[model samples]
Target: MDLGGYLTRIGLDGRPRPDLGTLHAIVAAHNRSIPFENLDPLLGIPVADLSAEALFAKLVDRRRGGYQYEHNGLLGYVLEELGFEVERLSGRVVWMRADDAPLPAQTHNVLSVAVPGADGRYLVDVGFGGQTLTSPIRLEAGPVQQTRHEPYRLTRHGDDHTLAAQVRGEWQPLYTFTTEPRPRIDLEVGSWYVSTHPGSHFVTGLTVAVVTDDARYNLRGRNLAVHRSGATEHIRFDSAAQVLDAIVNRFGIDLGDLAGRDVQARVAEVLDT
Candidate 1:
């Protein structure tokens, strides 16, 4: 991986110190710039391997967006290159409603970043679909950690932890994870399942999100939402062109030459359903 190029790709201006401030800065900038998208799987494109070359080619060179594995995988590589103690942790996304049953797979990827001499690790994830973090949250339990956009907290349950965000005075569970380090093969398997399985959300519908200083934007199938201050402005797209425009302009994603057509086809199919 071209370290310098990676920094430039994420729009980092200066040299980054291997510290908490830099870590926060990198995470914030990355989430704001590159979006959380699953167009490849939606368009029937084979998910790329989690490699430095593959990640950079698709994310940076092509200016495309990707899902959890691709987003956090690239961030992990950049952090490790910058001398940060980063560990890969798998997570089960249970973005459930008050009455919904939880899913059973560890389909999400997050980072456990240890500041050089700091006592506690921080949960840093640039991926998590629509509600992805725009800043790093301390790994401390109970206290509500404030990010730029939302208030998140970590709750400890024995050896496991649940990460939640406070929305409308309600603590919503985003995902649960353990501190156990995950291997590359483990991540690869999870990514493959998410990208190819018929039951996976990414394969069945359009899911795109991006963060900005002001708000977070999301598009699930034909429903478009702009989230801020726990309130959302929702709209539904009736045409594929509208969805494509939103994905490009709002999410900052560039669908490459042929990928755009495939995505449009997929979008129409999703809208029809």
Candidate 2:
């Protein structure tokens, strides 16, 4: 991995030392710069590789974004290269489900990072889409942690832990995970399903997200949501052209290269009845 280029990609300054402060800075910068998107999969383009070089090319060089595997996969390499101890963990997403619903497979990626001489490890992730953690959360259970964006808490269940966010006065479960490191093959399998399987949300609809100092912007198909200071503003795009414009202007992504008849028709279906 090009560690120097990776840091530059996230707009991080100087050589990062293996310390808690530097770790937080890198995670926060990555979250703010590299957005969470699934445009390739939505465009019927297969995403087969999850290598660091491939991810960096797409997310940094191409100025595009990707889902969990691509986001966390790149981050894991960057952290390891910077002399931090990194562990890859898998999680089952329950963020958008009912409380009594059955648990899904471990389709999400999470990182456990330990800074040199730090008191404890922290959970660092940059690919949770609209509700991603803006900063690293200490792995310890209990206390409510304040990220740059929102309030998050971790609840322990023996070996497993559940990460929740305080949204609209309620604690919502984002995902559940354990510290057992996931194998590389596991990531490949999970990413394939998310990118190619029809049952996966990334395969069916349009989803993109990016964070700035003031607000977080997201788009699911034609529906656009801008979130800031605990309030959300929603808008519905009337046409495919408008949706493409919003993807470029609001999310800071250029879909010019992806413009074509097939892509246009797929985008139009978002607003089609």
Candidate 2: segments with Cα more than 4 A from true spot: 256-261
- Tens-place lDDT per residue, model 1, 118-220, is 8888899998977887788887788989988778989988978889988657889988899999998899999999999988889998888888887888888
Best by lDDT: 1
RMSD of 2: 1.9
Q: lDDT for each of the candidates?
A: 0.84, 0.83
Model 2, 1-273: lDDT tens per residue?
Answer: 567767777887677788888877887788777778888888777677877778778877777878999899888888888899999999999887987898788889989998888888999988888888888889888999998877999998898899999876788989998999987778888888888998778888888888776787778888878888858899888888888787777667756557563666787875532
Highest-scoring model, TM-score? 1
Q: What pairs collide in candidate 2? A: none
Q: Estimate each model's TM-score.
A: 0.93, 0.93
